[PDB]
Amino acid sequence: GPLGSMSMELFHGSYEEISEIRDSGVFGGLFGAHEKETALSHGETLHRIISPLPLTDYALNYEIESAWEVALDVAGGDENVAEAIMAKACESDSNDGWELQRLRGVLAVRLGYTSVEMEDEHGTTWLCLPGCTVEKI
Ligand SMILES: NC(=O)c1ccc[n+]([C@@H]2O[C@H](COP(=O)([O-])OP(=O)(O)OC[C@H]3O[C@@H](n4cnc5c(N)ncnc54)[C@H](O)[C@@H]3O)[C@@H](O)[C@H]2O)c1
Numbered sequence: 001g002p003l004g005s006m007s008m009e010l011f012h013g014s015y016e017e018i019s020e021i022r023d024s025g026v027f028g029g030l031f032g033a034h035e036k037e038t039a040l041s042h043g044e045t046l047h048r049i050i051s052p053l054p055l056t057d058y059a060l061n062y063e064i065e066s067a068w069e070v071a072l073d074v075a076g077g078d079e080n081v082a083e084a085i086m087a088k089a090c091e092s093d094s095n096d097g098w099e100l101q102r103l104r105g106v107l108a109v110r111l112g113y114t115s116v117e118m119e120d121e122h123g124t125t126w127l128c129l130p131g132c133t134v135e136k137i
Contacts, residue, residue, distance in 0.1 A: 003052050008115070010051070010126055011036045013043030018134045021049075026098055028105045029129040032115070038122055051132045055113035057088045064111060074106045088119035105129055 010032025012018065021029050032049045033039045039046055060067055068086070075082035081100065084092040085107060090100035101118065105127045108116040114131035117124060128134075 001053075006053050007050050008054050008126075010034060010049045010115075010128065011039035012047040012049050012128070012134065013039040013041065014045055014047065015043050017045050017136050018047050021128060021130045021132055021134055023130050027102045027127055028109075029115075029127050029132075030134060031118070031120075032126045032128045033122060034124075045136060047134050047136055049115075049128045049132050049134050051115035051126065051128050053113055054115040054126060055108045055111065055117065057117040060107075060111075060117075061086055067107075067111065070110050071107055074103055074110060088117055088124070090118070101127060 012030045012032050018030065030049060036046060068082070071082040071086050072079060075085065081092060081095055081103065084090060084095065084100050085104040090097055090104055092100065104116055104118070108114070109129055115126045115128045118127050
């Protein structure tokens with residue numbers, strides 16, 4: 001679909017002023033919240049992130065044919081972590097939670113998306129990957 005037709009609007013708080021979303025950092029992107037108030041609790045400078053096409057958790061597990069094999073390829077064949085990154089919580093007793101979150105971001109890039117539904121203390125947040133637009137205030 002024409003780019004922008006599915007865009008969702010999120011906010012990111014940081015100490016920096018973000019120009020673009022580099023393929024770098026712990027997660028390979030930025031986390032966005034639905035409420036400006038939530039983003040400000042994470043930083044002083046507020047940003048607007050716009051993901052042209054986000055990947056909902058439902059669409060991941062239920063509407064995308066053979067996403068499991070793609071999650072397997074990014075998990076190095078370890079079917080225990082691939083199972084963990086198909087789900088928002090990104091939880092397993094054997095792996096680092098944030099590396100699970102990063103690998104979940106890799107999934108969406110592989111599947112052709114630019115943000116992924118995530119779970120966190122706030123509730124649902126989104127890992128916004130390169131492809132989104134970030135702009136201050
Ligand atoms: N910061 C937020 O707005 C926000 C929103 C929702 C959830 N969270 C939660 O907080 C936890 C950690 O999130 P975080 O924001 O503090 O991560 P983080 O602070 O460790 O890394 C992100 C920081 O690095 C900088 N950065 C700039 N460009 C970047 C890029 N292209 N890739 C990576 N970093 C970049 C940003 O200033 C950003 O503040 C996550 O588990 C998430 O659940 C944070």
